[PDB]
Each structure stands twice: as structure tokens, then as C-alpha cells.
Design a protein around this ligand. Structure first.
Ligand SMILES: *[C@@H]1O[C@H](CO[C@H]2O[C@@H](C)[C@@H](O)[C@@H](O)[C@@H]2O)[C@@H](O[C@@H]2O[C@H](CO)[C@@H](O)[C@H](O)[C@H]2NC(C)=O)[C@H](O)[C@H]1NC(C)=O
Ligand SMILES: *[C@@H]1O[C@H](CO[C@H]2O[C@@H](C)[C@@H](O)[C@@H](O)[C@@H]2O)[C@@H](O[C@@H]2O[C@H](CO)[C@@H](O)[C@H](O)[C@H]2NC(C)=O)[C@H](O)[C@H]1NC(C)=O
Ligand SMILES: Nc1c2c(nc3cc(Cl)ccc13)C[C@H]1C=C(CCO)C[C@@H]2C1
Ligand SMILES: Nc1c2c(nc3cc(Cl)ccc13)C[C@H]1C=C(CCO)C[C@@H]2C1
Ligand SMILES: [Cl-]
Ligand SMILES: [Cl-]
Ligand SMILES: [Cl-]
Ligand SMILES: [Cl-]
Ligand SMILES: [Cl-]
Ligand SMILES: [Cl-]
Ligand SMILES: [Cl-]
Ligand SMILES: [Cl-]
Ligand SMILES: [Cl-]
Ligand SMILES: [Cl-]
Ligand SMILES: [Cl-]
Ligand SMILES: [Cl-]
Ligand SMILES: [Cl-]
Ligand SMILES: [Cl-]
Ligand SMILES: [Cl-]
Ligand SMILES: [Cl-]
Ligand SMILES: [Cl-]
Ligand SMILES: [Cl-]
Ligand SMILES: [Cl-]
Ligand SMILES: [Cl-]
Lengths: 563, 563
């Protein structure tokens, strides 16, 4: 075996060798890094794993954190890709290391993966998150970790010691602390740790940039199709107390006061089986919406000092290099979750009537006048009725609101405040794809290429896609290594320039070589980031004034019934 | 002379022969068609000209209606083009006929010209409104007429018999009635009368379509860079009483009541010299604005049954053919009248700060939130600071708001309700032009080509422009004759298709042959015509609610000063 035996601070580990077409890899999977967050420890921040006698079995992925299983489309190929492979447990706090073969002699750059899934789902075990190709190809160390999701990770009762919220992000931190201690045992270099995440994963990465307690734990960030300042990534304190109290209520838990609240609430909440908690998860979502999740990070003053957008503007970002991007059709897949017209089984050619309706679903909690504004902008007024154009439109609406425009605002604010930033649009549809053509390149389908999954011989990927992934892994590795993706020096391949606030350049990642484009959905984002709030603000002080007018006409009307 | 002697219902006339490069023309200019609207008759609708002993001298243009003379740029070539050539009088109600040589044997189509100039200026005598080329080339009869402008034509005290408003439009009507009676005396055919106007002229034409008393007086309409439903073309009853009462006040005229009001007001108003009235004309304009005029037609219930936009939607338009259009850079010239940054003497390269400011001037009387919306839409968010782009932007703002979007709404509403409509964009800059390049093809510079003025040898026009005008006159004549501009049949020249509500096709009139384009500033107009009102409506019921909140905090604050 040569070296599948490794000793980290807690104890000894036994790993497994993994085959790749290029060579081999040493993987150590399921390394416990926190005390199992069960019983009294549910909802509580992670305590570090006590050290162990014996040799820990690190030959296999540990069980997936307890979560909802998305089963809209039973037995569908492209839907079980993201579904939990290992069994479900609350005892799920484990991490995974892929290091080259043989273990490198000098300390080498580390990549740490944080998965997405709305903070309601996800696992480091998923076959698309296998680090063996990326490690074999770029000869760097890759670490991924499980973190608590759903209520188990994000249920907050802001200001209580028994459920303070954000523990899911604490899990992520604890693993990074583990990384500083134990990553050298694998040839890793705790002075060159680059965070990369996608979706909520990307939103997490962003929150670690914003929380000072984490800043000493990494040196670079990559945000894929997500941002800590997106509308679905954070919830207020008031709002999360409501959601957790509703969940408590559904599940049968009295609040009140003599000792607790809220200690007696959370105490009762821990007696509940995990499934009972997950059964009632989606009830607590306020509105009609798509791309919204019940339990997400809270702005509590603790982990996040202020709201992500606030911290973003204020922050100094010198000495940071961050790589940001999005897929071509971010919004597309979500519309099958209740936008009238959409299914994965027809070309979702919506009628204008269906367009207008879904605008209210894709953009939740907005006054009438606001959705008028979304329509105005996202309508081709030369083809208002055209069904294909209306389909792409509601898909850009959902994409721009949730992903492309939060990311674009961030990347501007960073770049202009000290960070060297590089932006990309990943616009290549996988040939192995199993979803309808109208979805295009949907949310999360760049991931399988970054991890060089095309190289897997069992998988039916094309030759130029294999090459594509290798180009992509190199881009990413050159980042983690140097904080610049475009090679050490300049080959014959076109150069990827930093995204800045003015020129706003970015690159297009598809089979064709790097094309530089100026403008990241610039015109759309002006609406979302600059104009819309000045509007919503007014409709807010107008829905307060139409409310005072019905109260003042109710008493007026009664003075008439007397007459 | 063969036939420069003609007898119309009122009496005999003596005309003059006019030379053109093609041949000759018989013109009869300054034919009195109403009793001079002076003394007791000021502000009163026109009475028809009593018949006369003798031979009336119709060899020369009669004096121009009393008006303000625009003298921003003293001694400027392109500014005195529109200035009054004949002397000024209130005795100005005269009309002009150009008929072919020799007088035609069969009754031939008639074109009636109504000049523009904001209802504050204009004259049928202006050298650019000479009918000799158009009549010689297309062998049709052309009639133009003076009509009262400014207070003398549009000062209203809605509902009084002594100043009922709209008399300027009554002047235009009276001439058309004259046309039914006397146009056959010249070879004209009172069953084929086509109205054509530009600017306020076009807005007038539009109002005759909307007033049933006029409908029996013409058969086709051409609207050039103007529409009866534009924001500057009509004023409310309340608003025009205010303007006329302010004017009365400035000029020293007591209102009140014992006999009149408002008879004693208007009585006093008639004692005033005409200049005293014109001195005080622009004081009565409410806001800060550009492209707004003091005295314009009033929606009184009389001439206009309801507001032009209202009448437009409701109306039946079958059996009507109307030809509509605009120049390339409608908005451009107006910005030198107070938009900060603009002069005809520099390239008006405004700063973004100047852009934001002029939006409030080009679009008057709009809430803060509304101008935010104008900015959002008219800003290239990839080049927000670019001065040339901001210059063109505020020019499209003024153009789209005042001209292109009112016209586009009209042409859609007509087409879709029975009229056969043809739309054009006149995008050719005159080579004789004397205004700065940044103005492009400005408001009113198609006129000189429609009247075939390039053919004038004294004028320094180019060969292909001469040809251009001839192509244009033919387009216009084929309309007046047949109600279809694109020839009787189909040559080798590309065919001009009717503008419709859906496809919205139009043509581009410049030196190059007809190019058909789909979409008449479609995306801009959605903002102006569909969205903006839903907004202004809300900011209206929000500025009423922020007003009730300061009244309710004034009494609240005093209950604190007591405490
Ligand atoms: C595209 O699909 C939707 C819904 O799903 C349809 O397509 C298949 C998945 C299959 O299950 C099929 O039987 C199913 O109806 C269609 O919209 C639905 O239309 C029905 C009436 O047919 C309504 O009563 C439903 O409310 C509505 N559901 C949704 C989710 O909108 C839609 O008609 C179809 N598009 C077309 C016209 O091809
Ligand atoms: C373009 O012109 C304007 C105003 O007119 C200027 O240009 C000539 C016509 C000449 O009369 C010249 O002397 C005159 O100033 C300029 O804007 C003006 O700037 C001055 C200060 O220089 C301000 O005090 C004025 O308020 C302001 N007036 C207007 C009408 O805006 C402008 O600077 C110029 N553009 C450039 C920078 O070339
Ligand atoms: N369950 C899915 C996921 C992702 N993408 C998906 C795409 C499709 Cl088409 C269908 C299903 C998908 C990417 C990640 C994001 C989410 C939700 C957004 O945080 C869940 C999971 C991981
Ligand atoms: N005084 C002018 C006029 C017109 N165009 C002008 C263009 C320039 Cl660049 C400068 C001056 C102009 C066209 C018509 C419209 C108006 C005002 C709009 O009803 C007045 C007059 C006739
Ligand atoms: Cl394997
Ligand atoms: Cl031991
Ligand atoms: Cl090595
Ligand atoms: Cl809050
Ligand atoms: Cl700021
Ligand atoms: Cl910072
Ligand atoms: Cl609509
Ligand atoms: Cl470095
Ligand atoms: Cl865009
Ligand atoms: Cl804005
Ligand atoms: Cl002459
Ligand atoms: Cl006589
Ligand atoms: Cl003839
Ligand atoms: Cl009114
Ligand atoms: Cl209607
Ligand atoms: Cl009608
Ligand atoms: Cl701004
Ligand atoms: Cl006919
Ligand atoms: Cl447009
Ligand atoms: Cl709208």
C-alpha cells in the first residue's frame, strides 16, 4: 500500500487507493471532525472530535446529513444525481481528503469544497463531487466536508444559547480549523487554502469572507452560481424566529415562560424524531415562490455582523483573489416547481397569460407595480406573445434575481475595493444531459466538468469534453495555486482578464477557446440592483398608506350607518 | 396670362404665375377666408368672409398671424428659416392655392397644408411651405392657410361665449369649408382632400379626425412628427382657465362678477394691444420643461368630445387612410432651450450629472421615482458616464416622450380599428443644414424635402437630394390620390407595407432605397405608453399620502410643544 496509513491529531486513519485514467490517488473518506450533533447536541454548534484509540476506517464515505429527498420526478436519471447515496443520519459530521500519489514532498495547495443544495440538501459523498480526477490531474490536495442542513443546521431562535442559528456554517468552519491542523499530514499546505463552492455552497464561501473569525482559515475563494447576498441565502432574525416557532407548533411544541422560553421549546424540539422535523420543513416557507428555502443562515449579529450586502460595501478586500461565475441558464430548472406552464416533459411553451402569472412566482413578495416593472423589462414588446421568448424570459427573471445579479454586484464591490476578481460564464450543455433542451445549461451543471468527471471511462462523455474538463481543472488549479487562473505565464490561449467595476470583462467557458466579453447581464442588473429597491421602498410606504385609508374608511363608514 | 383670373364664391381674384425648373404654376395667395378677428372679434371663432366688389389682389402672401418671434440665436441662418417673413397682424386669416398650369380639365386631388410651431408660431408664407414644386411635379392642387396662434388662437376660458378656446382649429376648419365650396374653381376636387401637417400641424390634422364636425371636410390625413395625443398638444379645462387668468392678471385685468365674469375679463383683455399679450405669453407656463407651449387646444367637450387618447381608442376608423411619421432625431433641438449642457455651439457632451438633471427638464412634472425609471431605461449601464451616449439619450427621451411614442400609439390604434396606415422614419440629414452634427435630422427637416425645395436652383442642394425629393413627392402624391403611397402599381422599387398593430412595419426614407423595418422604437414606447402611467398613478396616490402625513405630524408636533 506504501502510504494509505496516516496519523492526524485525533488518531490514526486507514485510507483507500482510487484508480483514475491518469494514475492513482490516495483518498481518506469519512474522517470524523466533530462530536456527533445528536440528542442534547442537536441545534448546537459543533464540538471538536475527541481523539481516539485505534485505527479509524477511512476507506468509505460516511452517512449523509439528515435532509429532505427531492422526489418530484421518481426514477429520473438527472434528478437522482443529487440525491443522497449514503444513508441518512444526524451523525453526519465527517470530511474527506484526496491527496496525490505519491504523497507530495513539499507542501502543496489545498482546495476545499463546500456543496450546494439550498441549505436543505447536499452531501460531500455525491459521485459528482469525487476529487480523484482533479487531484490526479493537477496534483493538489482536495478536502470536502458534510455540514448540517435544514432545521438541523439552520433553525434559529436568534439570541438563545440552545438554538443560535448558523451552526451549519459553524460545521464548515470547524472543518477548516481541522484543515489548518491536519492538512500537512497529507502533503497539504495550510497557507494556501482556496475555498470553492457552488450554489448555497458558493453563498457559504461568501459568508466566510464576511465573517472575520474565518478569515485566518483560507486565502482564496471561488463562488459558483451563488452569493452570500442573494435573496434566498439569508433570512432576518424576526423571520427565522417565525419559521422556527411555526415548525415548533406544527410538530407539537409549546412555547411560553418559566425557565425557558426558549429553552423549553428547543428542549421539546429535541425529543422529536428527525423525520417528524423534516416532514414539516416546507410548511414554514411564507409565500408562493420558487428558489426559496426554509432554513438558511440568519443575520444574527454573531456570524454575520450585519447583512451580507452591508458587509460587502464596507469591507476592505485587498490581498484577496476570488473567482466568480454562473451557468448560461441559471433560472431554468426552478420553474417546474410551480410556475404555471412548466414541466420537464413538454417544451414549456408558456402563453403570455402564463408568463405574467409566473413572474409572481419567480419573484415572490413584490407589489403589483413591481411585477409590472419586471414584465416591462423582460418583455420583447415586438413579440409580446411569443411563447419561446416568454419561456426564456421567466428563466432569465429567476436567474437574474437569484443568481446573476447578486454575483455581479458582489464581484463589482470586491474588485473595486481591493480584490483581484475573475468572472466566467459557463455556457456549455453536457452531452450526457438528461433534462429537456429548454433548460439549456442549468444551475449546477458546470460542477461535473470542474471535477473532471468526463474522464471517468464508465461515463459516456465525448473526447472534446474530456479535453474541456482538463482545460477547466487547469484554470481552477492555476487559481488555487497562484490566484490567477490563466496559467502561470501566457501560452497561445487567449488571456482571462480580471473582472473590474468599469469594463466588467468575463470569459465564456465552452468547447471553443476563451472569448472575452464585456458586460455581465449589465442592463438587467441595473433594474434589480439599482432601480427595483427605490421602487419597492415606495410601494412599501404606499401599502402602509392604503392600509391607513381602509382603517379610516371603516370608522367613516360606520358614522354613516349611524346616520 | 391665359388664366390667372378666377372667380370664387366671395368675388373675383387675380393671381400670379410662378416659375419652377419643370414648368410653371398658377398661384393665388392671400385669399381672405374669414372676417378679420380683431376688436370685438378677438378670441371669437371666425366668421366667414363677406363677399366683395372688385378684383382681390391674390399676387402675394398676406401678413402673418400675430405671434412670438423665437430669437435665441440672433442672425442665425437655420433659425430665421422659421421666422415670420411677412409683417405681423391680427388681420391674418388668409389662404393660398397652387394649381397646375394649365388649370386641369378634370377635377384633381387636393392637398391641404397645416403648418406647425407649437400653436405659438407659424405661417403658410414661409419659403419652405411654397407649393410650386409639389404642384408642378405631381400635378395636384395644394392649399395652405393661416390660423391664429398663441393667445389669439388658443386662450380659453372654458365655457364662456367670449373666449371658448380652440378658435385656432376653427380657423383651420373654416378654410376647409372654403375648400369644399371654392376648390373646384382651380381644378381641385373636393371629394379627394388629403390633410397634411407637421408638428402641431400634425396634431391639428389628428384633431380633425377626432372632431365629427370636420369629418365631412377631408378624406385622408398625413401626420408628420406630431399627434393630437402628445403631452404638449392638449391642455385640460382647469389648466387653460388658470393660464388665461394668469395672463389676464399679468396684463392688468380684473376678474370678479356683476354681468361677467368672465365677460368683463375678456372685455378688458381685448382692449390690450397685441404685443402686451405676447409679452406675457410664456409666463403662464407652469413648470420647468422643454417642448411645452402656453396656449394649445383645450379638451372642452366642444371641439373635442373627450381627451384625444380617449377618442382614439373608442373611434371607428374604417374607410380612412392615414400616413404617419417622424424624423430620426426628434428630440435633439429642444435641449438647447434649457437642458443643462446643451448649446448649438459645442458638441453638447454632457456629464452624467447633466444627464440626470435634464431628464427633469425634458420630462416635466414627474415624481422622483418616475425620473429614476427614465434614467434606468435610457442609460447604457455598460457606459453610464459616456458623454456622447448621454447626449443621444436625453435626445431620445425628449423625442420618444413628445413625438415618437404618441404617434406610434395612434398608428397602432388606427390600424387596428379600421384605418389603412403607412409609417415612415425620415432619417436623412439635409446637406444644406446649418445646425450642429449632434442634432442629426432634427424636428421639421423633412418638410423641405416633401415640398421639393431641393429643386429650387438658388438653393444649394445636391443632385441625389433633388432626386430624393422627387421620390418623396411621388410617395406623398400617390397617397393623396389613392390612399397608398407605393405607386399605383409595383415598379422595381421595394414596396412600402401598411403599418399594423402586430408586425409594426415602417420604412426608412433616406437617399438609399426603401428599407422596411419592423418595430417603431417599440421597447421605449412600452415604457412610455404602458408602464409609466401605472407608475405615475401610484406616485400620485403616494404624494397625496405623504401630504396627509405632514399635516398629521404638524398637529402631532404641536401636541408635543404643549407638553
Ligand atoms: C406541459 O405540462 C404541464 C403539466 O404537466 C403535464 O405534462 C406531463 C408532465 C403530463 O403529466 C401531463 O399529463 C401533464 O398535464 C401542463 O399544464 C397543466 O395543464 C393542466 C390541464 O392540462 C392543468 O389542469 C394544470 O394545472 C397544469 N399544470 C401545470 C403544472 O401547469 C401544460 O399544458 C403542458 N404544456 C403544453 C401545452 O404542452
Ligand atoms: C457648451 O455650452 C454651454 C453654454 O453656452 C456656452 O457655449 C457658447 C454658446 C458660448 O456662449 C460660451 O461662452 C457659453 O458658456 C456651457 O454651459 C455653461 O457653462 C457655464 C460655465 O462655463 C455655466 O455657468 C452655465 O450655466 C452653462 N450654461 C448652460 C446653457 O448650460 C458648456 O460648458 C459647453 N460645453 C462644453 C464643456 O464644451
Ligand atoms: N437538485 C438539484 C441541484 C442542483 N441542480 C439541479 C438541476 C436540475 Cl436541472 C435539477 C435538480 C437540481 C444544483 C445544486 C442546487 C440545488 C438547489 C439550489 O441551491 C440542489 C441541487 C444541488
Ligand atoms: N423653430 C423651429 C421649428 C421647427 N424646427 C426647428 C428645428 C430647429 Cl433645429 C430649430 C428651430 C425649429 C419645426 C416646427 C416646430 C416648431 C416647434 C414644435 O412645434 C417651431 C418651428 C416649426
Ligand atoms: Cl471506485
Ligand atoms: Cl490504540
Ligand atoms: Cl509532487
Ligand atoms: Cl430583523
Ligand atoms: Cl456605499
Ligand atoms: Cl473585510
Ligand atoms: Cl400585458
Ligand atoms: Cl500566493
Ligand atoms: Cl442585459
Ligand atoms: Cl436608477
Ligand atoms: Cl419667385
Ligand atoms: Cl365690381
Ligand atoms: Cl391635368
Ligand atoms: Cl380638467
Ligand atoms: Cl381599450
Ligand atoms: Cl371616428
Ligand atoms: Cl446614477
Ligand atoms: Cl379614393
Ligand atoms: Cl427600442
Ligand atoms: Cl407593463
Amino acid at each position: 500500500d506504501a502510504e494509505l496509513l496516516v496519523t492526524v491529531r485525533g488518531g490514526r486513519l486507514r485510507g483507500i487507493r482510487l484508480k483514475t485514467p491518469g494514475g492513482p490517488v490516495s483518498a481518506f473518506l469519512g474522517i470524523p471532525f466533530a462530536e456527533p450533533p445528536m440528542g442534547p447536541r442537536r441545534f448546537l454548534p459543533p464540538e471538536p472530535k475527541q481523539p481516539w484509540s485505534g485505527v479509524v476506517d477511512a476507506t468509505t464515505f460516511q452517512s449523509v446529513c439528515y435532509q429532505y429527498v427531492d422526489t418530484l420526478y421518481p426514477g429520473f436519471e438527472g434528478t437522482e444525481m443529487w440525491n443522497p447515496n449514503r444513508e441518512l443520519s444526524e451523525d453526519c459530521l465527517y470530511l474527506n481528503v484526496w491527496t496525490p500519489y505519491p504523497r507530495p514532498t513539499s507542501p502543496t495547495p489545498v482546495l476545499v469544497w463546500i456543496y450546494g443544495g439550498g441549505f436543505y440538501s447536499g452531501a460531500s459523498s455525491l459521485d459528482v463531487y469525487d476529487g480523484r480526477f482533479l487531484v490526479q490531474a493537477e496534483r493538489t490536495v482536495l478536502v470536502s466536508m458534510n455540514y448540517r442542513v435544514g432545521a438541523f443546521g439552520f433553525l434559529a431562535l436568534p439570541g438563545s444559547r440552545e438554538a443560535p442559528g448558523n451552526v451549519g456554517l459553524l460545521d464548515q468552519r470547524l472543518a477548516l480549523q481541522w484543515v489548518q491542523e491536519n492538512v500537512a499530514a497529507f502533503g497539504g499546505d495550510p497557507t494556501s487554502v482556496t475555498l470553492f463552492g457552488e450554489s448555497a455552497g458558493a453563498a457559504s464561501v461568501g459568508m466566510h469572507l464576511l465573517s472575520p473569525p474565518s478569515r485566518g482559515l483560507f486565502h482564496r475563494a471561488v463562488l459558483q452560481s451563488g452569493a452570500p447576498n442573494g435573496p434566498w441565502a439569508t433570512v432576518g432574525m424576526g423571520e427565522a424566529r417565525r419559521r422556527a416557532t411555526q415548525l415548533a407548533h406544527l410538530v407539537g411544541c409549546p412555547p411560553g415562560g418559566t425557565g425557558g422560553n426558549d429553552t423549553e421549546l428547543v428542549a421539546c424540539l429535541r425529543t422529536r424524531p428527525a423525520q417528524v422535523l423534516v416532514n414539516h420543513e416546507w410548511h414554514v416557507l411564507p409565500q408562493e415562490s420558487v428558489f426559496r428555502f426554509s432554513f438558511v443562515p440568519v443575520v444574527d449579529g454573531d456570524f454575520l455582523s450585519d447583512t451580507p450586502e452591508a458587509l460587502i460595501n464596507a469591507g476592505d478586500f485587498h490581498g484577496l483573489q476570488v473567482l466568480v461565475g454562473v451557468v448560461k441558464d441559471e433560472g431554468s430548472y426552478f420553474l417546474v416547481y410551480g410556475a404555471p406552464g412548466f414541466s420537464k416533459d413538454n417544451e414549456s411553451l408558456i402563453s403570455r397569460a402564463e408568463f405574467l402569472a409566473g413572474v409572481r412566482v419567480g419573484v415572490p413578495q413584490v407589489s403589483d407595480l413591481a411585477a409590472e416593472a419586471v414584465v416591462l423589462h423582460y418583455t420583447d414588446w415586438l413579440h409580446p406573445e411569443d411563447p419561446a421568448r416568454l419561456r426564456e424570459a421567466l428563466s432569465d427573471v429567476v436567474g437574474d434575481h437569484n443568481v446573476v445579479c447578486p454575483v455581479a454586484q458582489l464581484a463589482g464591490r470586491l474588485a473595486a475595493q481591493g480584490a483581484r476578481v475573475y468572472a466566467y460564464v459557463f455556457e456549455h450543455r453536457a452531452s450526457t444531459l438528461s433534462w429537456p433542451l429548454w433548460m439549456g445549461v442549468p444551475h449546477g451543471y458546470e460542477i461535473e466538468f470542474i471535477f473532471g468527471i468526463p474522464l471517468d471511462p464508465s461515463r459516456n462523455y465525448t473526447a472534446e469534453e474530456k479535453i474541456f474538463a482538463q482545460r477547466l481543472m487547469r484554470y481552477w488549479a492555476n487559481f488555487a495555486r497562484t490566484g490567477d487562473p490563466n496559467e502561470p505565464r501566457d501560452p497561445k490561449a487567449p488571456q482571462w482578464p480580471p473582472y473590474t467595476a468599469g469594463a466588467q470583462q468575463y470569459v465564456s467557458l465552452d468547447l471553443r477557446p476563451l472569448e472575452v466579453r464585456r458586460g455581465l447581464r449589465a442592463q438587467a442588473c441595473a433594474f434589480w440592483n439599482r432601480f427595483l429597491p427605490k421602487l419597492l421602498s415606495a410601494t412599501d410606504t404606499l401599502d402602509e398608506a392604503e392600509r391607513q385609508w381602509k382603517a379610516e374608511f371603516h370608522r367613516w363608514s360606520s358614522y354613516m350607518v349611524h346616520w
